[PDB]
Amino acid sequence: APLNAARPAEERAALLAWVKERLHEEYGDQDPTPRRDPMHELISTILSQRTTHADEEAAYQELRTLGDWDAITLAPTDAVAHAIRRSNLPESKAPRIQETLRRIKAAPGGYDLDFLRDLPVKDALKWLTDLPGVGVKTASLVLLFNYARPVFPVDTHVHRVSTRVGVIPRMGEQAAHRALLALLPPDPPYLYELHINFLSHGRQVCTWTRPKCGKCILRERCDAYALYGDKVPSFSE
Ligand code: SF4
Ligand SMILES: [Mg+2]
Ligand SMILES: [Mg+2]
């Protein structure tokens, strides 16, 4: 009996579409994501590096008390750093934010990313990942959620469930963005449902430590259960 992770890409894509159908029945069109507007999502991410959810939201809203975006680009970095002080090491985050805002204003349009809509996917991605503090996961999130482009953001929840099941072998999170997208159709609503359903399943069942495999709708095709049964270890390295 071969593990899922060693199976051909075509077999692993059939597996992932089965996974998506099962998660759709457990969770439907349920959405545990922030669903923010583009500028909010981008800046939030920068503030949300080595930082809890409650502290990032607090850091974002106090940031926005400095003024609108144009005011934050011009506010002295001392003021920006003190406002976001409840996030991860505000000294480093404050310049990345200012520079990101600066580079967005210079783009065609106001503090808005209307051009990412009708741009080649690879090019839209590369433009966001060139912004300081923005990685492929945040760029994929903004492109999928706000502009309905066919990209698939892979957060820790998505990465953990998909790896444990064996839809992909173990690899870095950035490499997993290309690997899973390669198994998926260019169908933005499909990708967004798949994403939010992974978040629900990772938060509720396939948890970082002690997953609840006995309540898991995927257990019968899960590599991790096949290997460890009731003793699936914490998602490591
Ligand atoms: S069987 Fe366990 S490890 Fe596998 S997907 Fe379900 S909860 Fe995660
Ligand atoms: Mg602009
Ligand atoms: Mg970057």
Author numbering: 19 to 255
Question: What do the study authors state?
Answer:
Endonuclease III (EndoIII) is a ubiquitous bifunctional DNA glycosylase belonging to the helix-hairpin-helix (HhH)-GDP superfamily of DNA glycosylases.
DrEndoIII1 Y100L shows more compromised activity when compared with wild-type and DrEndoIII1 R61Q. Our results demonstrate that the affinity of the DrEndoIII1 mutants for the substrates (with THF:G mispair and C:G pair) is reduced when compared with the wild-type enzyme. In the Y100L mutant it may be caused by a reduced steric fit of the Gln to the opposite strand of the flipped-out base compared to Tyr. MutY also possesses a Tyr residue in the same position as DrEndoIII1, thus it is possible that this residue in some HhH DNA glycosylases is optimized for stabilization of the substrate upon DNA binding. Additionally, the DrEndoIII1 R61Q and Y100L crystal structures include two magnesium ions, and the DrEndoIII3 G250T/N251H crystal structure has two chloride ions.
